[PDB]
Each structure stands twice: as C-alpha cells, then as structure tokens.
Design a protein around this ligand. Structure first.
Ligand SMILES: [Zn+2]
Lengths: 89, 219, 131, 110, 97
RNA sequence: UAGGGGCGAAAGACCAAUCGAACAGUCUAGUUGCUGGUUCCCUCCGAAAUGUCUAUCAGGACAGCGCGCACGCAGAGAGAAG
RNA sequence: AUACCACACACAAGGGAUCGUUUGGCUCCUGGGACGAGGAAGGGCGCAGCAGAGAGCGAUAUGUGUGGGAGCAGCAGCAAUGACCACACGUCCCCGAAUACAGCAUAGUGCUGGAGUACUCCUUGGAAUUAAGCAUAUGAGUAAAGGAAGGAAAAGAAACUAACGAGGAUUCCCGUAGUAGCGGCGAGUGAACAGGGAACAGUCCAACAGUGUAAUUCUCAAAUGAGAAGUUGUCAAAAGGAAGAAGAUGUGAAUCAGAAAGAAAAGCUGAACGAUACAGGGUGAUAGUCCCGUAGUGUCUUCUUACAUACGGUGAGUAGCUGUGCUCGGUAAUGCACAGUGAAGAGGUGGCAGUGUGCAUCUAAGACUAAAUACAACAGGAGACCGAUAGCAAAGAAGUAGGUUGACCGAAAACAGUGAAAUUGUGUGUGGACCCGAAUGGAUCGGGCCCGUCUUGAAACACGGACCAAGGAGUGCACAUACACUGCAAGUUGAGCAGAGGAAGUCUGUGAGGCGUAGUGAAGACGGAAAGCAGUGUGAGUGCGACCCGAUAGACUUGUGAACUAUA
C-alpha cells in the first residue's frame, strides 16, 4: 500500500553537495544542479524577487569591493616604496 | 502581503481565511493576509497621494492680515491673549532708529525700560517637558509666546535681542498670520521700529483707496 | 539657535553617538573641572581624570569627601575613589563608582606623559588666541 | 447607476498607470537659483542672457501681439553694420533658418 | 461655445503689408558648370558599357509598333508612379531617335 | 521516456500519503446578481411588499409611498342641495 | 448539605493585559552611483592562553609607516622599550567565468567571457478581468522570458510646422483636451500646432588632397641608414588658467550657598553672572553657567574647466508600387516588416481616393553633440508617522532556529518595572440556575422561555456561540453635481515660473489658459430674456483592492520531480 509500508523502501539519494553553491541540490544522474544550473556558464533564473534577493551582492562579505572603495577615496596611492613609477606614469 | 498563502476551503472544520504554506515551524497553518489577522495587511493602507496642502483666496489672506495688524493696538485683545501689560505706559510701542546697541547686556536694559520685565519673566519660568508621545518625536519642550519685533531696515539690534527667551523677529513686508495670530487668536504684542511703522501706509494704503504695494486690493 | 544643517538635533541620533563612542571620543567623556588655584598653575580648565590624582566629590552620598583615584571604568562610565564604599551582609566592602562630572580635581598625578599632554593643549590655545 | 448625471467617462482602468507627485517643488527651485548665481560669477561683468529678436505671433487669434524669437538673421545683422563673428562675441543670438518677408519686421529688428 | 461665429468671407481678410522681393540665384559659376558636365558625362559611359534592362527592351519594342497606350499601362505597372512612367517613356523615345 | 506531456496484458489505472490533466512560484487583493459579519448615548419624524419595461422570475432601472431644506398659502380622505 | 454546587469579600497561587520607556522600523528630501583573467560576486575550510555561535582576519591568520596617547570588561598574565584607536600600505588557503580553454584583432602589446540590471534602450509576447452572456474589442503592447549600456540613458539641429502681418534643433513643465476623431458607433478608447515658461550650441564624413615626385603612420639603428603598412589612396594644426565647488579639522563665555524633606537635588528659597552662544544630548528627580556641543571664528586637502588651416548641392536593391501580416487617434492607409517588382537626378510634403496645373515649404536613404528630465543598493538631514499581536519577515548569534527529494518555504523572544481578567486553594458570610418589582425576626409573594441572524412567521426538533484578554470592517484620489458657509463681481483665479527672505512657511511680480458676460441650425449661415468665478466642507453617482472575508477555474516561466509507482 501507498502510505506507511512504501516509506520503508526509500533508501537511495539522488542529490549531493554542489561545488559552485553549497546547496545539496546536484542531481547525479541528470548531471545538473537544481539551485544554480552548474555546469552551465551563467547562473539559473531565480523564480521570484523575494528568493533572488537572498543571494545578491552584499549578502556575503564583499571583501574585494570594500577595499576598492577605500583605495578610490585615498586617490589610488599605491605602495610607497614605488612612488617614482606611479609619478612617471 | 509577503507570504505564500492559500485558503484550505470548506470541509476541514475551520474558517476560510487564507493560511501560510510552511513546515517545521509553529507558523504553519496560521492566518495570513486579512486585516483581522496578526501580521496581516491594514485596511485601506495609508498612501502618499493624499492632499496635504490647502488653498485660500489671496483676497482673504490680505484682509485677514490687515485686521490682525489692527488688533495689535486694542488693549482688550492684547490682555485677552494673556500678554501682561500692567506696567507699559501706552500702546503701540515705537522704538527709534539710532539705537547703536551691539551686545545682549545693553539690549536687555533697553527692554526693561519699556516696562517688559514681567512679560519676559513669564516666558523664562514657563519651560516644561510636553505630555505624551510627542516628547519622543523631537518636540520635547514647550514655551509661552512673547513679544514680536518688526524692523524693515537692517540693524544691529536684531542680533542683540534674539537670544532672550520668547522674543521673535520678522520683516514688515512679509509678516505672516502664524506670527500675528498664534493658535488662531488675535492680538500679539508688537515692538515696532520707526521705519516699519511709517511703511504701513504704503502697504495697506488709506480707507477707500487702492494700495500701490498690494495690486488690486482696497480696504 | 543652530544654523549649520550638517549637525543633527535628533534625540535618537545624539543618544546613539554617545553610547557607541570609541577611541579619543571616549576619552572626552572622562573630563572633570579643575579647582580655582590649578587654573592659575596651568592654562587648562578641564582634563581627563587618571589614577593617582586627588579629587573632591561635590554631589551624591559621598559629598565633601576627598581621596585618590583608584580605577577608571571606560565601558560603564565611572571612577572609583579611595574610601568610598558600601558594606554587604557579609561585612565585605565594595567600591561604588562615581560619574566623572560629579568630581573636581585638587592635585594632578604627573606620572608618565601628563606633562606633554598639558603642553600640547596650552600651545593649541595660544596659536589661535594671539592671532 | 442611478439618477441624473453627466455620463461618467473616468479613465482609471489601466493597472500599469504611474502617478507623479511634486513634493520636491520648493527644493528644485532653490537649486535652480544657486546654479544661476554661480554661473553669474564665472562671467562676472557680462549678462547671463543673450539678446533676442522681436517677432509676430502665429494665428489669426494672436496677430496683434509681439513676442521674443530665437535669433537675428544674417540680413538684420549686416544692415546694422556688424559681422556674424562680432555679433556672437558681444552676446547677440543668431538664427540662419529664419527668413524676412516684410519691410516693417526688418526695420524694427534693426 | 466661442467657436464658429464669423462667415468665411470675413475670415479671408488680411492686413496690408509692404513686401520684399525674392533674391534670385540664377548665376551659375564656371566651376559649378564643369561639375555638372562631368556628372552627365559619367552617365553616358555606364549606358555604353552595360546596355538596357529587360523591361526597357520590351518597352522600346512596343514603341516601334506605335502601341502607345499598351506601353503606358505596362510602364505604370513596373514603376508604380504615373509620373515616373511618363518621364521614362520620354527618355526611351529620345534614345531610339 | 516529463505535464495538454509520459507510460499502460486497458481499471481513466499509475507518474514522491495529490491525477477525467502533477508540483513550485507569479500575474492576483482574479470574479461573485450568492452565504456570514459590520464597534457610543439621548431627542424628533417615519415606510414598502404595488404598476410599466428587462436572456426577466433569489437581480435592476423608472414611477408610487419616508425624511431634510422650505418660496409661499384659503383649504378639506365628512355631509347637504341640484 | 457537616463536607457537594454557586456567588460576594480578604489573603496566597496562575497568567501576562494596562500605564510609564525605546542605540529599531517607515515616509519625504539631498548626495552618490565606486566590480571581474592584476581571478569578481557567491560558497567551503582554518586562525584566540582558557573560545560553541556571531564579528574580525588568511599559514605574515593584531606585520610596516604616519597622527595621536592609558589602559587591555571575567581569571591569569601584559603595557611610556607604547595599552587602545584612526588613516593608508604589505600579506591574502581551497572551489567558483575557472581557463595549460574558446572565439577574435594588430608591426607588436592584446581584447571579450561572469556578476548587477531600481531607472534607460532593442526584441518577443499572455490570461484572469470589463462588456451584467460572448466570439471583434477591453485589460495591453502590460505581465512573463531573452539581449545590452551608463551615471543617467534615449533623443537632437527640419526630404518640420502653418496658411498668420506667420514661425524656426532636441528634452522637460503649464496648456490646447477627455477635444478632433477611433469604436458589435456598444462597453470603452484618444493625439498635434498655437499661447505662457525652464535650459540653451552647434558641427563632422562621402561626393572632392600638393604630381617639379606619399609630403602620411609604425619599427630598429644611427646622428643619418635599413625594413613593415600604404597608390584597390595615406595625410586638412596650438600651449595655456585662475576661478568655481565639496569635504576634513582647530578654537570657542559665564555659580555658589541654605531650612524642611529624600537613597540621591539639577527641584524649591535667597544672592549673583554670561549671551553674535536659551539648537540638542549626558549627569542618582525638571541644569544658560557640572560634562559633550552650539553662535562666532581660524587652517588645510582634493576635484572641475580653457586659442589655428581645404570644401557643397545626385549617400539605390534605396524611395515608391502590387499583394500580405501586425500596428496607430490616423479615418478610401499612421508606422514597421516579408515576397514579387523597381526609379529620377532632381525629388519629398501641405491629416478626405483619382487625373491635370500654378503656388508655399523642405531636402531622405552616412555620423556626433552639453544643459534643463528619470530612479535601487550605499551615505547624510528632516517628520501633525508606528511604538514590541504595532512598525520591515527581522529593536538580541534574522533570511536565523527549523522544514521540502527538489524548485523553494520560514517563526518566537524588550525592561531581572507595574502586574488586570479567565481559572485554583484557604478563611468568613449568603443561597440552591439567574434577572426585574416589593418586603420580613422568619417560612417568600407577583412577573419573566436564549441571545445574535435570514424570514409572512423563532423558545424552537433552523444555523453560529465552552471561557477571558488584546487585534478586528464605508477609506484615499480624479471628474461632473445639489446644498451650507466666505471674498470680490460683468468679471474671476495659489497655472507653471521669476524677484525678496538664515527658508519644504510667508510676501511681491510677470503672465497664459479656462469658464462667464445671449442664442439657433448637420452645415452654409444667421442672431433677439435670465450672475458668475474660485475656495472650505457635507450628502450622493462612476472608475481604481473600493465596507471586510470567501470559489471551482484560466494563463505564463531558459523553475522542479521516475528515491513511491508504469514500461524498455
Ligand atoms: Zn549549485
């Protein structure tokens, strides 16, 4: 029967951890990730605005982008040992 | 309106309000979007398209300001607002030009000589913290209204008197009804400058004539 | 009246600026007045209280007392003064902290960099006073 | 629908319709003032605005009224003894599209 | 309603201006003449090198039989405009002569 | 091998406790002539369940009967006598 | 009724309402609009003396330099041989466009790819809904899906309007106008020139380059040589500047004492003092003079911007035509395409089909362009906004705890305040369901069926309701309208926009348009009664979620599923 007794046979596992996004959604037989479309070059279309804002720029650390803004503020000064190269250029 | 919600329909022994689709949390099966629901949407949400300002005819604005100015020289009205004028010799007050004052120290001595001491004291003693939620929204302290000084020509006296509590300043040419009738009751006490007092004849004209300064207006 | 529009007059903003202060701005919170004599001995009118300096308590329970500053709590803005304490049920004694502004300085601790700190402030005045 | 009225015709059916409010009106006025002021310093002795011709308005309804136009014609400028390069240097506006068809209109602009 | 009160006769009146005559531009300078000559010359060489197109042959054939009204209808359908047809017929006629 | 599509020794069976057209999310607060509900006090006036037309018969509109503001004013839900 | 059941009051339990408070939210305005092969955005894993989560940082996981200067929150230890902070730099593990790759250009060096996409441009393209049914039409060229760029983007100097006594690039605001018209002429749709302003700026290529010599660009050498591109055509000139704006930071006046009372005075009482500073915040109760500021004044650093040569009148599978499909208010074709057909050098247009002829106005099939205009992330300032069941989902380690096979889905919890009601125990009183009227020392007497709701008709064998708290439903805008109130009146008006002003307020100009000052007809045409305009509000109609809640269904996606079950 289709209820409790059929639950006993459910011991196989079709999805594993995706290497691009972490989300335990890589379908091994299809060769595709259901969250991010790996191995396609572009990321997947997200279903709605609510769901996509959960993965935008600024939801993580933004390491490089923050440093760039501080350097731009300072006038891109560079390493002080090498000022002469900068000044010539 | 954020959540994914749907009605369960009849046959489940429950009211047919929309409910939240979820699992693993106590939030499953709770009642979603309606105005009678916790965390739902308000009835007729407030909206930016409301009409904030109001029109008034220019002819009424001109007439109201004229009869507000008039009331500043009837003792019954001035006393009625709550300005105290027991010690003042006569109304209206007109200060001369050739006031060479630059310091607040000497400025107060002048105002005391015109009899204003009791009025000024009445303002200083008044400061209190407002009752209600307004004290959280940048409206913390309340003070009583005092004298308004009206000038027309630029003078040092303006920056000598301004730090004294309850003193207020405006030019005659752009004198406003909010300053002339606070709270919608008329008869504010006014210190005129000699130049400003003479200018009232150009501004409002003469009875059954037309003002040159206010085109299309007659008294 | 304030005529500069870059400075805030919001109650919410002024309060956050107080409690979340750090660095030099935190040091400004620990300032106290000098006595009349010291204001002739030195140019300064007020300084940040440090251990070892001598203070008169001018407000509160311990009014009129005099003593040496033992400790400076920067996180919970309080100073501990020698001989200002309460006794528990146990008989054990706990120093009670006083807010900086309720103190007045009577003698300065001149250990370490204090003499240079004072010099730096006096010069900063004269630089603009004489102009 | 009941009673006597002028029959409705109110066009609010389209759900994609945008609304425009004007809360910025006093502030944008203040910015336009401050831009003119600083522009006036950059060319201090000279007026901020150029000289423009007088032309006659268009239809039967406005024939009897005169108005400012875009620029003087090469013929107007020449008749008054100037050259085009000089006129520009002295703050006169120029429009080479306009034509002259009357004696009166020419005489006034000279 | 402030519309449709005057008659058409009175709407046609006009104010008495003084007009300026138009400046005629008839003189054509030496260099402009040579320019035009060279363009017209170039048009000869193309016709000499490459000859007539199929519908031009069919058209000129009808002109020899004096089938004037047939040629007119034919050319109208090829070029679209009755003006272009009238012009092209006149150019073809002159070529044959 | 995937949704107006699959697969079926054929029962409209089965396609993640869902199938005479799956699930997720959005358009969308889809529509409702139909059912349920609609939050303080006193004072004064006070109905209708009928006619005409309607894809009209559990609905509308127009007229008839209420109330408010009222320019004004010799009238009357009763009798006599021809 | 000894002990059960009910009610009242006092005390103890049980719960978290109410009042007082808020380093959070929301809305409007101003600035900003800064990513990546020099490896981004996003994911994982490591790093502390005792260290889980979160924050910070990369095996250099608190290093160097500059400016300052006192502690490191617990315990043990450190610190003028520099605790801690601020500015810049150095170092920067593994996965990921992920590349020892793909496509492509140059004499050579190289460039693209992924992320973001609120606002702008280019394609593709619904249905619910309204018509009280429905098929053309509407919603709507909207949603959805794809491509691309910048701080704005697009557009832009007439193959343009107009018929006046004419004007003169583009964009934006007021207006013509809910008009001319389109439409099962139904429902409904719907522009342009004028007239008043903001801001203003014009120019390039081809046609068409010295022939007494390619005079032109590049490479190596050298101080004057070799070589590459190119005759299928290269080559058409100036430095230069002070202004303007935004930030950062220094300084910065003036008070003491007292009875009563309180844990504590800044309150209250007396006596003083400052002010170009009485904006606001902190201190053990309500502070101009106790602390941080404010008015007024100094310094410094960045950014933006500016003079030269030569020319005209023919830019083709184009304009147009026939057929066809979509589109627009565009109507015997407004714009865009596809197939046939296909010009002239002279052509295009003048809101109704054709043919002819004068007249007016322009010059298509190649390119560039400032200012005035639009709006997320991030930063700053304001508010007749909300005050922990509200305001963002989120005032704490919130897109978290936790959940789906998957796409995706998603909470609660403020103060160690106050401490209501439901409900429970103990004590003391009064009754046997309770309400209204009237009383006794005391038995009781008389009257009353359970509320809300549809209904001719409810106590009903009609439906909803166990009990208490808190939340919980006729609102906002546009357009005509009748009434009440106000100013002026043959007139009336806060259009936008300019001038003044320590300013989202107020005052003053310039100056359109609209409606009114009289009507009749389809129109040509004619002409002869009746106070209006603009506001502040109330009743009422129509369109938008439209008093609040509620279908079975329809469509769209470059979204997901054969772990159960079917077949090869
Ligand atoms: Zn993935």
């Amino acid at each position: 029967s289709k209820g409790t007794p059929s639950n006993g046979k459910k011991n196989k596992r079709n999805h594993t951890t995706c290497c691009r996004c972490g989300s335990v959604s890589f379908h091994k037989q299809k060769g595709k990730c259901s969250s991010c479309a790996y191995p396609e070059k572009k990321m997947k279309k997200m279903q709605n605005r609510k769901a996509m804002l959960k993965k935008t720029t600024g939801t993580g650390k933004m390491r490089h982008m923050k440093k760039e803004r501080i350097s731009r503020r300072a006038g891109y000064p560079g390493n002080p040992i090498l000022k002469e190269i900068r000044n010539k250029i | 309106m954020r959540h994914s919600a749907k009605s369960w329909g009849t046959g489940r022994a429950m009211a047919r309000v929309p409910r939240v689709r979820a699992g693993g949390t106590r939030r499953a099966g709770q009642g979603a979007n309606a105005n009678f629901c916790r965390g739902g949407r308000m009835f007729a949400p407030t909206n930016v398209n409301r009409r904030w300002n109001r029109k008034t005819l220019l002819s009424i604005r001109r007439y109201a300001s004229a009869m507000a100015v008039a009331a500043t020289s009837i003792p019954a009205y001035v006393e009625g607002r709550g300005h105290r004028i027991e010690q003042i010799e006569n109304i209206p007050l007109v200060l001369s030009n050739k006031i060479d004052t630059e310091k607040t120290k000497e400025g107060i001595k002048i105002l005391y000589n015109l009899g204003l001491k009791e009025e000024l004291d009445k303002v200083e003693e008044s400061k209190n913290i407002r009752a209600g939620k307004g004290k959280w929204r940048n409206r913390r302290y309340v003070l009583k209204k005092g004298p308004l000084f009206v000038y027309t020509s630029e003078t040092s006296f303006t920056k000598a008197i301004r730090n004294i509590p309850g003193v207020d300043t405006e030019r005659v040419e752009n004198l406003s009804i909010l300053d002339l009738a606070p709270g919608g009751q008329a008869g504010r006490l006014i210190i005129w400058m000699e130049d400003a007092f003479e200018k009232l004849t150009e501004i409002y004209g003469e009875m059954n004539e037309e003002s040159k300064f206010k085109k299309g207006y007659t008294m | 009246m304030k005529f500069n529009k870059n400075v805030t007059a919001s109650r919410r903003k002024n309060r956050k600026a107080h409690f979340t202060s750090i660095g030099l701005e935190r040091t400004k919170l620990m300032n106290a007045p000098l006595s009349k004599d010291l204001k002739e001995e030195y140019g300064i009118k007020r300084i940040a209280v440090r251990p070892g300096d001598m203070v008169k308590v001018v407000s509160g329970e311990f009014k009129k007392k005099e003593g040496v500053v033992m400790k400076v709590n920067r996180h919970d803005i309080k100073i501990e003064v020698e001989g200002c304490f309460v006794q528990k049920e146990d008989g054990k004694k706990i120093n009670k902290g006083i807010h900086p502004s309720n103190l007045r300085i009577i003698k300065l601790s001149m250990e370490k960099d204090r003499a240079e700190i004072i010099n730096k402030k006096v010069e900063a005045m004269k630089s603009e006073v004489k102009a | 629908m009941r009673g006597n009225q002028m029959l409705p015709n109110n066009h609010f059916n389209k759900g994609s319709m945008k609304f425009k409010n004007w809360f910025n009106q006093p502030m944008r006025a203040l910015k336009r003032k401050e831009v003119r002021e600083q522009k006036s310093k950059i060319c201090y002795p000279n007026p901020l605005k150029k000289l423009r011709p007088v032309v006659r308005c268009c239809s039967m309804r406005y024939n009897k009224k005169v108005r400012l136009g875009r620029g003087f014609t090469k013929m107007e400028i020449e008749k008054a003894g100037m050259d085009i390069k000089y006129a520009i240097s002295v703050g006169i506006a120029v429009d080479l599209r306009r034509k002259n068809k009357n004696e009166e209109g020419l005489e006034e602009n000279v | 309603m402030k519309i449709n009160k005057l008659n058409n006769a009175s709407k046609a009146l006009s104010y008495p201006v003084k007009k300026l005559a138009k400046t005629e531009k008839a003189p054509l300078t030496e260099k402009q003449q040579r320019s035009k000559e060279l363009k017209k010359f170039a048009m000869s060489i193309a016709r000499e090198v490459g000859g007539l197109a199929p519908y031009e042959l069919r058209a000129t054939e009808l002109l020899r039989r004096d089938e004037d009204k047939r040629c007119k209808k034919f050319m109208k359908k090829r070029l679209g405009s009755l003006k272009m047809a009238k012009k092209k017929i006149e150019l073809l006629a002159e070529e044959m002569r």
